Amino acid sequence: GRQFGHLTRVRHVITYSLSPFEQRAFPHYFSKGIPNVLRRTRACILRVAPPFVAFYLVYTWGTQEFEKSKRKNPAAYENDR
Template sequence: MGGHGPDPKHGIYLGGWGNLGCTTPQKGIVTYSLSANRQRPLAGAAHAAIFNTWRRFRHQVLYVVPPFVAAYAAMNWAVERNEYLNSKPGRLAEGTEE
């Protein structure tokens, strides 16, 4: 049970309790790190922004454009109708006098 000597079955040293491992340095363990000032936090941000914006626009355009077109058409009709009703021919057509 985690003895202090060589393992009789495999012939390797397990180490004492709380100190498991072998007496030789471990091999084959590689660690990589990158300094904070070498990282590129905005790498690809412009490219992603352009294509992400296009994707989002393409998926939302049919929800946004038709109401704006309808509102513009209604407003344009209302402005033209108001200008007509406040003109001399419009007042005569409605039967009101100046």
């Protein structure tokens, strides 16, 4: 019904909070957060990056593979005959 009223039934949870003025917008932002970078940046990086690396090779790989194929005619047949 009324969006919040009839949502669900919940029992014996307790919540604790302050006015925003009670605290600061940078509670050791640098110091505390900078480590957190790794645990997330390491978490997925196992799962994600490598496929692209393969691509990047192909990028140069085929290009190079392309390049000779045309660029030099006096290659397979040199200009002799």
